[PDB]
Each structure stands twice: as C-alpha cells, then as structure tokens.
Amino acid sequence: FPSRKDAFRAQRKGAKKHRPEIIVIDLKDHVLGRAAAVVAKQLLLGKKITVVRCEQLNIAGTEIRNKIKYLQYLRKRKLTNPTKGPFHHRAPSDVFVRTVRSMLPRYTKRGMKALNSLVAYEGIPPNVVRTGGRVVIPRAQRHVCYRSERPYTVLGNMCKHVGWKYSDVVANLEKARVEKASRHHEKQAKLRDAWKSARKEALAKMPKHNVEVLKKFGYA
Amino acid sequence: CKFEHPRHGHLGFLPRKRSRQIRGRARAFPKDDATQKPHLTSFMVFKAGMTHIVRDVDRPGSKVNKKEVVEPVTILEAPPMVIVGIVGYRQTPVGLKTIGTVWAHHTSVEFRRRYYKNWKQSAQLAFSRQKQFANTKEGKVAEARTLNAFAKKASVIRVIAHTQLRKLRNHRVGVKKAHVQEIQVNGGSVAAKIALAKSLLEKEVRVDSVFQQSEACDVCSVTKGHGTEGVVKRWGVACLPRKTHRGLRKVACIGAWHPARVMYTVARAGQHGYHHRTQLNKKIYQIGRSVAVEPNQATTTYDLTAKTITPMGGFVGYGTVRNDYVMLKGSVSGPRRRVMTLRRPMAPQTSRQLKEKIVLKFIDTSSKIGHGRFQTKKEKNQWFGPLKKDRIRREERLR
RNA sequence: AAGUUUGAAAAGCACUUUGGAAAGAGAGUGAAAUAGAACCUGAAGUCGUGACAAAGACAAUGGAAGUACCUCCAUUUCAACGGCCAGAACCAGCCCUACUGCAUUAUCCUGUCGGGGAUCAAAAUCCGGCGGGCAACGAAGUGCAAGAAGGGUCUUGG
RNA sequence: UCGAACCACCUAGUAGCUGGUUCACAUCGAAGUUUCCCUCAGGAUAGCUGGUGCUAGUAGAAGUAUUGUGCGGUAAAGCAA
RNA sequence: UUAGGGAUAUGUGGCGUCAAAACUUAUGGGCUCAUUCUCGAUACGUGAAAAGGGUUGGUGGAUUCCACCGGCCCCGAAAAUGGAUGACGCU
RNA sequence: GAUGUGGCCUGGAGGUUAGGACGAAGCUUAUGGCGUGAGCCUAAGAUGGACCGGCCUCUAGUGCAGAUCUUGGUUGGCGUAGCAAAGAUCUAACGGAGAUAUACUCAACAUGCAACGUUGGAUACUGGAGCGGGGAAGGAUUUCGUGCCAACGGCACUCGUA
RNA sequence: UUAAUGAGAUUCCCUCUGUCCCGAGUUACUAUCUAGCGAAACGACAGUCAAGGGAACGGACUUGAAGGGCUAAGCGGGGA
RNA sequence: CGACGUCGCUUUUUGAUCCUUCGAUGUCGGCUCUUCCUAACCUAGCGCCGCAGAAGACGCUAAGGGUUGGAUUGUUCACCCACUGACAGGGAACGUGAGCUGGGUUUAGACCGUCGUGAGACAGGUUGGUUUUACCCUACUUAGCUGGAAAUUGCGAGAAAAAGAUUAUCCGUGCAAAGCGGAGGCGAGCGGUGGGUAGUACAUGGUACGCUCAUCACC
RNA sequence: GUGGGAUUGUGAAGGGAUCUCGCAGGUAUCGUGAGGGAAGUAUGGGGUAGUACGAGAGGAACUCCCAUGCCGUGCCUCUAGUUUCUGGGGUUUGUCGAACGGCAAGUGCCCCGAAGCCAUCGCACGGUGGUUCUCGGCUGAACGCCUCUAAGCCAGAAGCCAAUCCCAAGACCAGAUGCCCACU
RNA sequence: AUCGAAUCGCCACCUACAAGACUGGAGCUUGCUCCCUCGAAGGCGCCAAGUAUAUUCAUGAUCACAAGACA
Numbered sequence A: 001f002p003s004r005k006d007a008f009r010a011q012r013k014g015a016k017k018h019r020p021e022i023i024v025i026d027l028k029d030h031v032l033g034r035a036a037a038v039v040a041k042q043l044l045l046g047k048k049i050t051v052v053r054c055e056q057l058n059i060a061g062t063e064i065r066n067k068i069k070y071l072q073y074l075r076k077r078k079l080t081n082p083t084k085g086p087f088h089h090r091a092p093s094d095v096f097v098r099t100v101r102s103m104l105p106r107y108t109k110r111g112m113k114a115l116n117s118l119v120a121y122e123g124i125p126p127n128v129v130r131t132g133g134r135v136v137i138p139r140a141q142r143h144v145c146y147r148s149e150r151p152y153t154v155l156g157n158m159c160k161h162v163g164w165k166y167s168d169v170v171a172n173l174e175k176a177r178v179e180k181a182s183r184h185h186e187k188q189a190k191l192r193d194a195w196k197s198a199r200k201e202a203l204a205k206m207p208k209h210n211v212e213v214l215k216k217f218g219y220a
Numbered sequence B: 001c002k003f004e005h006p007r008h009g010h011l012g013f014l015p016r017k018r019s020r021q022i023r024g025r026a027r028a029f030p031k032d033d034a035t036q037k038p039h040l041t042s043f044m045v046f047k048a049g050m051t052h053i054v055r056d057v058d059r060p061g062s063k064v065n066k067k068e069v070v071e072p073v074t075i076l077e078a079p080p081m082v083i084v085g086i087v088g089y090r091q092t093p094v095g096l097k098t099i100g101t102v103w104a105h106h107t108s109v110e111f112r113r114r115y116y117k118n119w120k121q122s123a124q125l126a127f128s129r130q131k132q133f134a135n136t137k138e139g140k141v142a143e144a145r146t147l148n149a150f151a152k153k154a155s156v157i158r159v160i161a162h163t164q165l166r167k168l169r170n171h172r173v174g175v176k177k178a179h180v181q182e183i184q185v186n187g188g189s190v191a192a193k194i195a196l197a198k199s200l201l202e203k204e205v206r207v208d209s210v211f212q213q214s215e216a217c218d219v220c221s222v223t224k225g226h227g228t229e230g231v232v233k234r235w236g237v238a239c240l241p242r243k244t245h246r247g248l249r250k251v252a253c254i255g256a257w258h259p260a261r262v263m264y265t266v267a268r269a270g271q272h273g274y275h276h277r278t279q280l281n282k283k284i285y286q287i288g289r290s291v292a293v294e295p296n297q298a299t300t301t302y303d304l305t306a307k308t309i310t311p312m313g314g315f316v317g318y319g320t321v322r323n324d325y326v327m328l329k330g331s332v333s334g335p336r337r338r339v340m341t342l343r344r345p346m347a348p349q350t351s352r353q354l355k356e357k358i359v360l361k362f363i364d365t366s367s368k369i370g371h372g373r374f375q376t377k378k379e380k381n382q383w384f385g386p387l388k389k390d391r392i393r394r395e396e397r398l399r
Numbered sequence C: 001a002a003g004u005u006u007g008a009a010a011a012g013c014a015c016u017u018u019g020g021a022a023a024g025a026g027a028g029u030g031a032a033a034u035a036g037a038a039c040c041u042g043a044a045g046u047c048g049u050g051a052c053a054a055a056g057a058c059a060a061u062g063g064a065a066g067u068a069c070c071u072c073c074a075u076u077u078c079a080a081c082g083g084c085c086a087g088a089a090c091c092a093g094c095c096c097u098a099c100u101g102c103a104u105u106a107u108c109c110u111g112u113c114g115g116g117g118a119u120c121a122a123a124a125u126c127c128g129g130c131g132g133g134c135a136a137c138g139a140a141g142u143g144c145a146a147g148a149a150g151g152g153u154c155u156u157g158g
Numbered sequence D: 001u002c003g004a005a006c007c008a009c010c011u012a013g014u015a016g017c018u019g020g021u022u023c024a025c026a027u028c029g030a031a032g033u034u035u036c037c038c039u040c041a042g043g044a045u046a047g048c049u050g051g052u053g054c055u056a057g058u059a060g061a062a063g064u065a066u067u068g069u070g071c072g073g074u075a076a077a078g079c080a081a
Numbered sequence E: 001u002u003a004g005g006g007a008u009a010u011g012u013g014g015c016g017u018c019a020a021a022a023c024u025u026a027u028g029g030g031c032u033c034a035u036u037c038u039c040g041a042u043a044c045g046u047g048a049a050a051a052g053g054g055u056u057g058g059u060g061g062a063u064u065c066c067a068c069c070g071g072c073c074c075c076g077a078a079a080a081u082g083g084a085u086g087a088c089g090c091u
Numbered sequence F: 001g002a003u004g005u006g007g008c009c010u011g012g013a014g015g016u017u018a019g020g021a022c023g024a025a026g027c028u029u030a031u032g033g034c035g036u037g038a039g040c041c042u043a044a045g046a047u048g049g050a051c052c053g054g055c056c057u058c059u060a061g062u063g064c065a066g067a068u069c070u071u072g073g074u075u076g077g078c079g080u081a082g083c084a085a086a087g088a089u090c091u092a093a094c095g096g097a098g099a100u101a102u103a104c105u106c107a108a109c110a111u112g113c114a115a116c117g118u119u120g121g122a123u124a125c126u127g128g129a130g131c132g133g134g135g136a137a138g139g140a141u142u143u144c145g146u147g148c149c150a151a152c153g154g155c156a157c158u159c160g161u162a
Numbered sequence G: 001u002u003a004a005u006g007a008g009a010u011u012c013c014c015u016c017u018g019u020c021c022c023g024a025g026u027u028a029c030u031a032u033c034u035a036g037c038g039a040a041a042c043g044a045c046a047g048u049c050a051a052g053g054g055a056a057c058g059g060a061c062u063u064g065a066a067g068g069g070c071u072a073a074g075c076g077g078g079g080a
Numbered sequence H: 001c002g003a004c005g006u007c008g009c010u011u012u013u014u015g016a017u018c019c020u021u022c023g024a025u026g027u028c029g030g031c032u033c034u035u036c037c038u039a040a041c042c043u044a045g046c047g048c049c050g051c052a053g054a055a056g057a058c059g060c061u062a063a064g065g066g067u068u069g070g071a072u073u074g075u076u077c078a079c080c081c082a083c084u085g086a087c088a089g090g091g092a093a094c095g096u097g098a099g100c101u102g103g104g105u106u107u108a109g110a111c112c113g114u115c116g117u118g119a120g121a122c123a124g125g126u127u128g129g130u131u132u133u134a135c136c137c138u139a140c141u142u143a144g145c146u147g148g149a150a151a152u153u154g155c156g157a158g159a160a161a162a163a164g165a166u167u168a169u170c171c172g173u174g175c176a177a178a179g180c181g182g183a184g185g186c187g188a189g190c191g192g193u194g195g196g197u198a199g200u201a202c203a204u205g206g207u208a209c210g211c212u213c214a215u216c217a218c219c
Numbered sequence I: 001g002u003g004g005g006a007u008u009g010u011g012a013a014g015g016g017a018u019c020u021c022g023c024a025g026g027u028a029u030c031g032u033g034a035g036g037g038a039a040g041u042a043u044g045g046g047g048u049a050g051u052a053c054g055a056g057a058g059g060a061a062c063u064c065c066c067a068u069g070c071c072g073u074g075c076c077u078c079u080a081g082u083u084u085c086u087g088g089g090g091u092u093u094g095u096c097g098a099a100c101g102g103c104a105a106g107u108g109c110c111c112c113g114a115a116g117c118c119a120u121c122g123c124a125c126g127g128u129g130g131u132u133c134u135c136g137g138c139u140g141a142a143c144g145c146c147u148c149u150a151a152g153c154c155a156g157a158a159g160c161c162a163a164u165c166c167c168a169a170g171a172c173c174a175g176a177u178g179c180c181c182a183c184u
Numbered sequence J: 001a002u003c004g005a006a007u008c009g010c011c012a013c014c015u016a017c018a019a020g021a022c023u024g025g026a027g028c029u030u031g032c033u034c035c036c037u038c039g040a041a042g043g044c045g046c047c048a049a050g051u052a053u054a055u056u057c058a059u060g061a062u063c064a065c066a067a068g069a070c071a
Ligand SMILES: [K+]
Pocket: none
C-alpha cells in the first residue's frame, strides 16, 4: 500500500502504471523438490517469480509417508522457549516458500533479495488471473518425473491433515475461478473464430509471391 | 528416580501478561447454524456484586433431589445496547477480511466520545462528514453497493453495538465513552442476517432479546489485577522451610545444568491477574427488568415480600442496580464496575444440569456491609422501633 | 612525593559591566595570555561538541577484489601537443582451430547345395559343406599417425 | 604477627622448578634416540643441525637394479619324520 | 606440499539447489519402495550380529513345484534438550 | 636452533660536511612519496620556541604487547550498590545572596524548587548504671570572642571540635 | 558403682505450638521513585540455540534454526 | 520357561585407562522445581493363554495423564506399618550448595579399642566443630518507548483489489452475458445544520420522525 | 524547485558557491489471525444384578445417572482467618492539680470489629472434530483353489493434528472505519 | 519538485480446463484400416497501415549507457 509521497511523486512524474517483468508459474502437478530447485536458481539469476496453485504440488510416495515426514519436522522445537523455535508453516504455498528458502543462501543479503522476489499463492488469486499466460517447468512435471505406477501425494491434502485449515476455502474459490474463466472462454469463441476465418481469407487476398514465401517456411 | 507430583499451573494460559483490553471480548462465536432464525450472540454487561439464592433442585438420583439448596449468584447490570453499524466478512485463504461498514445515519454522543481523549474540549467533528455524505444520493448508492457486496461475498455478518452509560447511571463507573464491540449475527442465510441487521440499525437491543432465563452463557471478562506477584501466589509452588537463607517464598531450583538456560515452564515472579478469560457454562438464574418498571425484583412466588435486587446499603463500591440485569449462578472473572461480555454457549448444552429449569424461592437482599440480618428496611424498622432520632424528627414535625 | 621551568621585564590583567561570591562578558599589558601564577613545550588514553558517513538483528576487528561518495595529497597533460581513456590494423612469440595417411579385418562378407526351424504357407534366427570375395557409406568407433601457414591474446612485447 | 614474635643485617640467600625476555629479511634447519650418571621434570655423551673451511673438481660415490658368490629357519608345511 | 603475479591444464573430490560444473548429459544396461528408528547415498570413520521373509537372478531334480545359493529391500534394531546422507529435497 | 646483511633504529665520542629567528628539538596527520621490511624523506600545522641533520669510524644503561611485571594517570561498571540500629519533628517571626527570582498572553494554582541559623511556642526523647555534673590515662588549644564559609564536617549549613 | 551438679551426648512421655498438612492477613525498616551524595568487585574480546566434530561438555568453528533497536524491575539456568 | 550352547544391545553398577581440569569446574544425601527417556506399574485400545466366570499370565500399539502417607537409618539401597487405580524404572556435570540445608564425609580439641619403644596410625567407634559475593552479559519472567518491505537506502513500481476511449468517458442489475433501468445560468433536486409548531417510537433528558422559514454545501 | 541549516582551525562586513536535511502524514476505533502456547485426568456408588458363566463355591461389564479425588482457571454471597478503620468498648502502670480530654509504654494490653485481602477451611466453572497405530475385517490377485494386501476399501487407542482456550502484524494486514492535513 | 538515473515485448486472439496407460473422429479385427480440421507453431510486433510507382535523414565526421523509450 503505497505511501502518499510515492503516489504524489508518481503523479508529478507523469509516468504510467508500471508492472515489473514477472513470470507466473502454474505449479499444479509439479514435483516439489525439482520445481523448488529450478525456481531457486532462477531467483538467484534475478528473475521475479509468482507461483500459483501450490496446493496441487506433488511429492513421491504415499500420503502417510509424507505426513509422517511433516510430523517429524513439526516436533523439532526449541525446548526452553518454543517462541523463537523453528516455525512450522502448514499452508502449501508456505511449504513451497520454505522448500525454496532452504535451497538459497538465506543468511546473506543476496539470498534474501532472491527469496523476496518470490510470491506464492494457493489457487490463482484474482490479481494474478489476467496478468498473462502462465508457464510450466517441463523438467519438474509429474507425468515425466514419476513412473505412474508409484503412489504420490498432493501437497494440499497432506497440509490439511497436518494443520492447514484453508483447504475448503481454496477449493470453493478455485471452483468459482474455473467457472468464471470457462464462461469467459465460451464467450469470445466467436471472436477467436472470426480471427481464424480472417486469416484464412487474408491468404486469398494477399499478393501471391508472399503466399509462396509463407508456404516454403511452413506458414501457409 | 524421585517422588512425583504434577507441575504447578497451566502452560496454556501463557504469558501471564496484562490483557490488551479491559473489556471482555469473544475470540470466537458459536458455530453458525443456518437452519435457525437469525439472532444476536452477545451482550455487554456490568458486574455489580454478588448475593445468594435458595431454590429446590430437580435432579432425580441426587441426594438433593426435591431439596432446597443455596447458590451464590452474581448480579450483572444490563442496560440496553444500541446497534450503530453492520460489518461483513469474506473468507480468503489467509482468513476473514471485513468487506466494509454500513454506519447508522445517527449516532449517540456516547458512541462518538469513544473517538476522543478529551471530548469536552474537542471540536467534536466525529462522523460529521460521514453524515453529510451518506445523507445524499451518492451516499445512498455507496451504502447500497456495500450492502450488495455483503450479500454477494460475505459469509459472516456482525453488528457494531455500543453500551449506554447515561442509562447505566452509575456513579463509580466513571467512563462516559461507550464501550464498542462487534456482535455476530447467527442463523439464517446471509440475506436474512443482513435484513435483521438493517432492521436493528439505530435501535436499542435488550438483554432479554439475546438471552432467555433458564439458559447458560459464556462470559468473556478480564480478571482482577494484583500487579507484580511472587511465585507462591502466581503459580502455587510450595514455600521453603523456615531455615532457608535469603528467602522462603521462591522456587529453589530454576533449572538443571543442561539446558544451560532457564526454560519457559519454570515459575517466575511477575504480573498476576488482569488476564482475559472465557469461563463457559454460567447458568442464567434470572433476567430482571429495571426497577422503574418492575420494583419487586427479588420477589418470588414463595417470598411475597416486596424487595429490589439491591441489598440493604447498596452493592459495596457499586451502588444501585437501576436497569435490566442478569443473575448468573456462581462467579465471573473481574471486579465490580467492570464491563463484561455474555456470549451464547459454545459447549454442548445437553447435560441434565445445563438443561435444568431454574425456579428461585428466595433471593437474599441483606446488607453486604457487616453480617446483614435484615432482608428489608421495614424488617429493621420493626425490630428496632422508635429510636431517639426518629423521636426528634417527629418533635420537629409537631413544631 | 615534589624541578616554582610565566615572561626579556610583573609589564601579575587598571577600568566597565552582571553576579552574594567564585567567576563570566568586555577592555588593557605583553612579540605571544592555547605565556594568567606551583602558568614553557603540552603526547597517549578517555571525554564533550559541531559537521558528516551511514548502519537492522551476522559481537567487533581482519583479508582480498570492486564500487559509491569524498579528498586542505601527489604527479602528469593542456594543439600541429598528452605520460590519460578507448577502438580497430599489422608484426614476433605463444595458445585454440579446420582439414588424415599407413597397416589390419576371415570367429568376417556373398552365391548356391543339405539340414533344421517356424507358422495358413514362407522367409528369418542356427549348423555343416562347397564356389567366389573388399561389408569399403566418411566401411570398422583397431593399432600407429609425422597432416606447414582461420581466432585469441585487458594471458606477452612491439 | 606464634608447631618458634618483631626490627635491621648476612641477603640480589639457592632453585635440575614457574613466569617473562624489546628491530627487519636473507641462507640453511632439527630432536624426543644411544651410553653413563642417587639417573627418571636434570645433565654429560654420540646422532640429527648450522657455521668455518681444507684438499689435485667427476677421485675411495649410491637407503636402486643386474650377474656371480655366501648367510638365514620366519610365513608356509609336518606329525603316514 | 608452499618466492608474488597472469594464462593454460590437471589431482583428490565433484557436476538438482545451497555451490563452480550434465541450464536435471546420453540417441546406456539392470536393480530397489522404505509408516514417527526415518530406505539409500557413511573410504579412513563415526549405526551392527546370530537368525529369518517383497521382488528378480542362479544351480541342481521332479512334472507349473522341490530343495539349495546370490542381489536389493524388509524384520531382528530400546535412552534420555529438538536435529541432522552437512541442509532442502530426491524415487 | 645456527649464521649473514655498504640491513633498519636509539643515547654519547673522534672525524668530516651541513642546517637554524626567513624558525632547531619535540608534538599532530584521509600527508603524500620511497623501501619486500625494520624504517626513511617531503608537505601542512590556522604547533612550538633554540638548537640540530647527513656521511665514515668509535662506544653503550641501545629497540617492548603481555612477566597475578614497576610507577603515574585514566577507565567501563555508574549517577549504579548504596548513604535503613540508637523512635522526631512541627509552627511563626527574625536573619540571610540563598527570593514571592517569568518572554508575549497572563489576577492568583497550573512557570524559582529544595534547603539553613536564632528566638518564641508546640511535640517528643535521654530517664540519675543519663546525648547530667566532675576527674585519671590519653590528647594538647580542641577552650573563649569576633569574623568567614575555598577545602573539610561521606546530605546540607547563614552553623562548626573547620 | 555413684546422690548432687552440667549452655556436655542420647531415647521416650505430658504440655505446647505455623515445624508440618497449607498456606493467609497485618506492621516497622528496606527494596522501589525523587533531591543531594556517591563507591567496589570484576573487566582478553565478547555474549541466541541444536547437532557435529574438536584438548573426548563451544559465544566464536561446520551445517541447520532463530535474531528489529533501545529500555525498568527481578531472577539465580549458564558465563565449566 | 528354557538347561548347554551361541549372538547382541545398554552405560541406570563397578572395574580398567589417565585424555581434559591441580595460578581450584564447591564434594554425599535430602528438600524445592522443571524437563526428558521407555526396557509399561496404573490409566486407553488390542491379541493370546492351560481363557468357564472372577482373578490373573504373556505379548502388541502406546510415555497423553498419574505413580502416595509414615516408623528406624545421614543415608542412596533396604523392609516394616498403612492408603491406593498404581504406589514402574531411569537421564538431565552420579540435574539442581552465589537455591537452601549441613545429618554423613574430610583439618585443628577430646575419649576408646587395636597397632607402634615413641612421636604418632587406623581404610574402626565416639563427641564438638565460620557454608562468602550478583548492581555485569545472556537466559527466563513480567514491564515501557520506538523505527522498519531495497528489513532504515533507489526514485528498484509485484494488491489473496477492480476490469477498460490501455481501468480515462456515469451509476444500478445481470454470467467478464443478452439485454434492461436510472443519469451564462436560473430554477429544481437531494441533503447538513438553526427557528417555529404536531403526534408517535424507543428504557422514560435525548435522539429520530411529519409540515414551514432560514442558512450551508454538492449537483 | 521550495524552505531551513551549515562549511576548516588566523579579526570585521557584505557576495557568491557547495553540501546537508524537511517537503506527507498525523491521531482514534473496530477487527483479521499466520506463528507460538495449550489441559483436563482418575476413582467410587446406583442400575445393569447376584444375572451372564457356573455342579457349586463364587461371580462381570456398557447405555445411562449420582457423587468424589487430583489438576486447572477464577471468585468473595456465605463460613473461617487476618485489623494501623489503633472503629467502639474495657483494663494496668506512669503522667498533664481533679473530673473531662487524653497522653506514654516504638500498635501497653484485652474483647468485639467493617471494608479489603484471603481457604479444596468457603463458592463457581473445565467442550468438540479429523487422522492414524496395534489389530480386526471387506473386496481381491499374485497362485486353479486359498489368502487381510499387492492395487484398492471399512472400522478403529488416554496416540498425533486441528477446533474451542491464551499471546498475538518483525506475520510488517493493498482488513474495515472516524476526523484533520497533503494530493486533488 | 528535487530527479540525472539501472530496467528495453506488446495484446480486449496466450492471459479457461483436464489427460500423458491414449492424443480429432470412426470401425471391428484391438492394432490395424477408413475419414478428417491429416494430429510438431497463442496472435501480433522487427520502419510505406503494407509489399509498391514511394518519401526527411549526413558534419552526431570509425566503438563508447539507445544522444531515446507512452509500441
Ligand atoms: K584454469
């Protein structure tokens, strides 16, 4: 929430509404550790990254194996004063942020800048929905990373069994988001179809030598 | 390999720090059941004092079944509250966020003094621009949009209620700025909650509209303060033998060598009292009307003597109960004059004790100063008869 | 313990001003009162103050390489001139290229007879003969290579 | 001030024991082993090191091979020697 | 194994992130699933035996099963502050 | 641990060369330059006030970070610990620089506080084995009057065994 | 062996009690806050933990986990 | 349950060693207080027995909760009385002495026995025998003030916000629909504050409400 | 750009120049709740019942519901403790000439004593969902058949997790608000 | 209004969704055949508003942060 000085200076400058170069990653069906490693290396390279749908990250193995792993991590606590002890975050996006943080030099200013370049969400919040096409990480996708006979866990289910209390909220919000997006996609089908037919007829309207040029490079 | 006993105190009431607020505030509300009619869930009251009652017990199998018992009770004065606003809450993955506030068109001076340290010497501009704006058509449209947003996105609806200290005409409660709390509306759909709340706006709510007589309630209040206290009182540890060099009222060993530091589970001296507590399952024994409407407050069907709930000589340090009030069985945290919150119960109300119908046979109204032995001033008058000063008064009357 | 070691002379601060006084602010003496009385010089350490630098919590200090800002410092240059910064050319020396010949293969390659195989029938995988042979694509990842002269040099000096 | 007072002196008593021991960089660079000692927390003594050199600078060299020629009773084997 | 500097190339050790290097190499073959002690990734060395049983290998017989022998995994396997293939994680 | 060094440095001596009131020694440094280094040399003092540098040789009480090192000074802790036995003072007037001490607004409170000695009055204590009145030992002017409050009387002082 | 005597050592009984069950309330003087006055001890440098190795019990080291700065009153785990 | 054999595990015993500490790490027990472990006594589930029932045996998951009062003894151990669901076992510098206590142990006084010629000795008995310091750092407990997202700086711009002439150029509704409904000035509208008047409502001194005159704003 | 300050030490007075800093937030409420803490735990009686089992002697448990330990959090109506309200009385020695009023005995001493504090010495209150263990099953292969598992499923412990409860934004809340100011 | 900056791809067609042991559709023979939108492009943007009869660029002199940036 910008200060009044920031707004006043922007008003004086006459500059437009700015948005930094941000990559949005859809983490659904991504392997937790591999996505974390890729994101951490890109953050150390200066990228600004927002990850969405952290509740649908995957870990190899049955849900009980990974819930027991989390409970083992949870019992680590400074006995003489649990405040200032290890802080155990239950939300899936918090879990991903912690996984990435453990893959960074978190005790330097450079690592801190890298970690503060990452924003994690459960689901896809409205401020992210329309910012542009979201990306995947092919080398960290479940369908190429896990042999499909093996059991795997979805991060949100494990989290909700270890203390995360926002599973149903995120589920209902994601259902509403998908319904709104699918209505907006079924509408505008006529606009996309109009542009397709326009390109098809443009082919018959342009000069012929250009058509041949398109043909030899695979565009016509 | 030693003799064993449990630890001293409850580590779940930590830290023993001074409460952030003096008012009792509900940290959670009862689970909302959409099948029930919309209803308020809380009410702010003021502790006046304590007395005791006699009732017969309806508990088959007990040795006191159909037998009289005497119960200490606490009297809490409950002048009506005023609803001044509506707030809506939408659910997000990081918790509830308030959508907005719909303010009443008119607020009391008492509600507005809550925004000031020195109201009498201030310009007294609170809510003036809001009044001038909301009164218009753009303001009417903004209110309509906020209400529509409540309908569209809210899962939780609460009303902004405040107390009336002018009606609580108490001389020892020095505060004149109203106490403000959010009261959650439970029951019905969100549209029904909004309709009930909109009807409630700028209106007075009486404690009998939120609570019924024989029910139970939870009490949110802050306990009496004692300042800095040692470990014996603060934690209940044992006193050391008389022979102890450098002091007896302390913990002898505050830790083993390792860990080479003091744990948070070791009793230390510090603040005791002035803590917030929630104190469930307080049975309501009576919801009385104000004495100016029904003066026979303590009269029952078995004691026909006309008396009010105020003991002879008044409640010590408090005065007269002038308004509606609530008789709670037992005790509640905090001193007299302190504002407290009554909340609809969160625990299951299906036990025999919690369902029992309470019928009072006697309500003690004897003096709380010094072994009171008269229920009424007429009883004392008929014991003593004409005293010297009464004879002097009549002698003056005849001249 | 302790140098009286002020200054060439006491010229040892008249007088004004405010303060009870101690003193302060002025003014005078003196070459110099940061020479004002146990007064030459007046160090370190510690402290005050003004200006500035910034600075989370990595105790601080430290090393090495930069950078931002400063610099009461040094040195150099200021026109047919520079000893400053930078870019391209060439040269010499190094360092990466691109380009590969000789020998060898046979437990191998091919044709045809016989068998043996398998399915609806075949061909094939396989084994013995016989006649021929270079598996020659960039043949084969088998032994040895001896093929002189585009791009790098803020990794050198001109 | 007492299992031998206090003061001055002999007395800077002696200590194989504890502590300390003040500028630079250059060429080299160890030993905890041997023998004797009332010797074992110390010395002498040889070795290891440095500095001097002397002598005709390829010599009377070698923590290594090879060939020739001697020495050996440990590993293994044996109890039908 | 060492004057103080550059370039080039190695040693031991590495090449998912921390952390330089396969931005997770191959147009290589197999094996392995593990639930509160965490399977494994522990040269020196710093977490184990006698004994036994999922999977996929071998040997020798009988008509698919019989016995026997390996690999990896599992059991056998209990300690005191919360904690350690270095951490995260990896299938 | 040994050894070398037209290797560095300090106080004096024999020589030889210089410098200094137009400023020696000493001292100060974001004050540069030179040296691998010990160090040397310059600059600037809005420092100082009278001696002293280089080179060869001679000579010695000749180089410091530490020895529960010696002497002097400083220092954090720190405006901290604390200045709590022996019961206790109050009031007015006087004295005193010790006040009724003020920018505007401002009647006085909310902008000079706290502390004194004397006299009067009040209150209390010692309680005759006395904070009574006299002596020895010991002390030696502490006695008395006037004055004065720099230091001392672990707070204060107009008071004092100062 | 001994009457009497004993600030000698021991056991039991009556009385009695805050010794204890099991603590609670009150006072004076402190602590505490103010004015005036004003030290010492101690002080390598400094001070958040877990594990690991390590002179075999680390504040510094390795790997994790914490940690915004400054303060008042206490307190006795550690500062071997 | 388990001979005789055999393989472990544990550091709650004692021994062995001598690595740390001898310009000093306070030494037994008790008291007080907190925490941890499980090799489970009780409490929760479950197998199994020679398990008819009741009582029990053995095992499994489980350390969340609990596990006393006394006589003698310095004791820890013990074992006796009694209560109980049960009266399990251990670790924390043999947890814990600037927390206490000081009974034992372990100086100097003294008595005995034994030993010694003796001064004296005893691993034997007995009695008497100074328990010092926190105001520093951290830890812990409470208690105040206060900056800060580039974790103080960059001007280094990321909303769990809206949805459009690129968020400008209206408001409502509706699916990010289809459409649908309102939107130079005077006057008007809508209201905020003051006068007059009139019921009523609310807990009943103090606000709201209908009509009219005034001002104020915005339109 | 605006404003306010200031440069380095050797007088005074005017000029520049250059730095530095401020230039937008204050103040008052209601809330969110990440993270951390965390708590309830036992016994008995009634009834089941003298019945199920049992030749007989003997001899159970749960729905339920009535208490009580312990622990925890509070409270002060009652009862109890406490008194420098030195409250009101009483009483000793001394003392102001006596009565009066008192006073001294560091609260003289004695009885009663409100308020406050306070006792398992008194009184009140202490709650709900998941998910698994061990284990028992279902469906069901490997392996005709079988099998509880191997792939799926079900029920399931005082365990674990969350709710309720306590702290809570260095968790930097673009949560909602009141009023000024700035921007406009 | 300091203020000179580093940043150099826009979009109202990507800015919906799910599956990878089955991907547009069929068929029966179940891995082959037949059909198609034939299974390997998000759309633009890169100097004439569009593919051509054009039209100003200098001397900023041969590299220098692009001397400029609302596409
Ligand atoms: K290299």
